Each structure stands twice: as structure tokens, then as C-alpha cells.
Write a protein that binds this ligand. Structure first.
Ligand code: 1WY
Ligand code: NA
Length: 306
């Protein structure tokens, strides 16, 4: 309890609204709306595809608060497996501008390409998502909303984590974030998060296991048919998501470890990177898929806290 805080010198970039045009709606609902768009900086021979996020809440001040908190976090992160803020645009309700991810979210992707998705892809996605989370952990960020819908696809070989609407920054030696009231997706949440509103890097790991389960089932809904109010008592009873058909015990065991009652018994993201990348060297030994396609680890898969 002696470490202080370093200054955050991230630049917040404010973009002119005239420099980009909307093209079509990509998605919308309660959260707000996301548009596909093209950004054309003033004195340059460049056109950049972007997503334009317009969050919607009860009032404009409410939306603007939430959206500026999200811009803070996204402006502070820079990793190949995490979405990056290009900047914000100061309309009546603020717009978040980010890179367009042309293949959409990973959840819809695995649903739409179920039949042409092999073991190599699935396992590398798991590696890449873990690399993203591990980086976020090194930035002392708890994501709190990791799910297949919140993983975006730049290319089938390259995915990035998105949606920092619920993300929280921990203090220097701080371990937990205690949430107030507020909707959070119960079916991706760790038990302690549901019971006590405690969120940690290890509660993010629980969400990761559920995200991997989504991928391995080719985009099934977790605990399908079950109402959210019944979930915590199910988990308290020791019940968990079932073993996906394509999964070997080796892979299913990793998921179960992510869903341990004891948060500190769950794997660390750095360990998941190692485990999944080892598996990715021999994909068909670990996933058994219809119509598919040394202990040595590369230093880029051996990540040490920063
Ligand atoms: C799971 C649903 C899904 O993401 N669809 C989807 C389809 C097609 C796309 O590209 C042509 C994309 N590209 C994309 N690029 C950047 C962002 Cl920041 C978002 C994005 C963030 N939040 C969202 C909520 C709803 C829709 C999109 C987003 N999307 C996304
Ligand atoms: Na392994």
C-alpha cells in the first residue's frame, strides 16, 4: 500500500464532424447505435473506414457521461488485440470513432461460418483474446463485459476486444472494483460478481471461459432457456456449462478452471495464452471437428507483468 499513481498522458483527439460521413447502421438497440463510416482528414490523401458509436441513455447528460468515461479508457489503451480510439466527435451526444472491423463481431461470425471454421482458427482466437485481456490486466483495467459479441474481427486471422462501457481502472495496488447498481450480463459474470458485485481480473477470466465456450459451440447462447435470476443458484449448486461436442477434456478442463469458485484458483490470462498456443500447434489433438482444414513457447507468447 505504498505505490502511487503515474500521470496518464494519453492524448484525447477531437475530430471535426465534417471530416467523416456515415454510410449505414451496423447495429443498434438499448445501448445506442453504431454506424459504418468513412473518415477523410483535411490535408491528406487518405480515406479511413471507421465505426461511429452513438450511445443512448435516458438523457443526454447521462449518455455523455458514460460515453466520455469510455473514451477515457479507450484513449489509454494501445495493443494489437484491443480496439483503439481514433478520437471523439463533439456532437450534441458525443460520438466515439474507432477502426471499422469489416467482418463484424466474433459471435455472429462463428454462427454464420459454423461449417467452415476449423480448429486452428478457434484456438488462435482464444490466444488472441487472452493476449488482449492480459494487456488490459497490465494496464490495471477490468473489462467487466467480455463476451463473443464484444470481440471484433479485423480479419479471420486477427481479432480485437471492444466495448469498454463497463471497464474500470484499478488503483496501483488495488485488487477489486466494487460496483454499485447497474445492469450487467449475468450469464458471463463470475459468481462473486453476481453475489457481491466484486470485479477483478479473475472475474474477467470467468467471462473469458464463457467466451471460449461460445466459440467452441459455434455461437450457442450460454444456459439457453434459463432465466438470469436462476443463474447464481445454479452456479452455487456446482453446475456449469456443458462440454462442447468438439472439445476434448483438455480444452473443457481449461473452461472449468475459469469457472472455479475460488477466483485465485482460476488461470491467469498469461497462462491461458501459453496453454492455448501450445494447443494451436496441434489443433486436431484438442478439438475434433467435422470437415477440419514440443513444450517450446515463443517469447511473444510468454508474457510477464509490466
Ligand atoms: C455482434 C454485432 C456486431 O458487432 N456486428 C457488426 C457487423 C458488421 C460490422 O462491420 C461491417 C461490424 N463492425 C464494427 N466495427 C467497429 C465497431 Cl466499434 C463495431 C461495434 C461496436 N459495437 C457494436 C454494436 C453493434 C454493431 C457494431 C458494433 N462494429 C460489426
Ligand atoms: Na496446453
Amino acid at each position: 500500500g505504498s505505490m502511487g499513481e503515474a500521470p496518464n498522458q494519453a492524448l484525447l483527439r477531437i475530430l471535426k464532424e465534417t471530416e467523416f460521413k456515415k454510410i449505414k447502421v451496423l447495429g443498434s438497440g438499448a445501448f445506442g447505435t453504431v454506424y459504418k463510416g468513412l473518415w477523410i482528414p483535411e490535408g491528406e490523401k487518405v480515406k479511413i473506414p471507421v465505426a461511429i458509436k452513438e450511445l443512448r441513455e435516458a438523457t443526454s447528460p447521462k449518455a455523455n457521461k458514460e460515453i466520455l468515461d469510455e473514451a477515457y479508457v479507450m484513449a489509454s489503451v494501445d495493443n494489437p488485440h484491443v480496439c483503439r480510439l481514433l478520437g471523439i466527435c463533439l456532437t450534441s451526444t458525443v460520438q466515439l470513432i474507432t477502426q471499422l472491423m469489416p467482418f463484424g463481431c466474433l459471435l455472429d461470425y462463428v454462427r454464420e461460418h459454423k461449417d467452415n471454421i476449423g480448429s486452428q482458427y478457434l484456438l488462435n482466437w482464444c490466444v488472441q483474446i487472452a493476449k488482449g485481456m492480459n494487456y488490459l490486466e497490465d494496464r490495471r483495467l477490468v473489462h467487466r463485459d467480455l463476451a463473443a459479441r464484444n470481440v471484433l474481427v479485423k480479419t479471420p486471422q486477427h481479432v480485437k476486444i471492444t466495448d469498454f462501457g463497463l471497464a474500470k481502472l484499478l488503483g496501483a495496488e488495488e485488487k477489486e472494483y466494487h460496483a454499485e447498481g447497474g445492469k450487467v450480463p449475468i450469464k458471463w459474470m463470475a459468481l462473486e460478481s453476481i453475489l457481491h458485485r466484486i470485479y477483478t481480473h479473475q472475474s474477467d477470466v470467468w467471462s473469458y471461459g464463457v467466451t471460449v465456450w461460445e466459440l467452441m459451440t459455434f455461437g450457442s447462447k450460454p444456459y439457453d432457456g434459463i432465466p438470469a435470476s436462476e443463474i447464481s443458484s445454479i452456479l452455487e449448486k456446482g453446475e456449469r456449462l456443458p462440454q462442447p461436442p468438439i472439445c476434448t477434456i483438455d480444452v473443457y478442463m481449461i473452461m472449468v478452471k475459469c469457472w472455479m469458485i475460488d477466483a485465485d484458483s482460476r488461470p491467469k490470462f498469461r497462462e491461458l495464452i501459453i496453454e492455448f498456443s501450445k494447443m494451436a500447434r496441434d489443433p486436431q489433438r484438442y478439438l475434433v471437428i467435422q470437415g477440419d482444414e514440443d513444450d517450446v513457447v515463443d517469447a511473444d507468447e510468454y508474457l510477464i507483468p509490466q
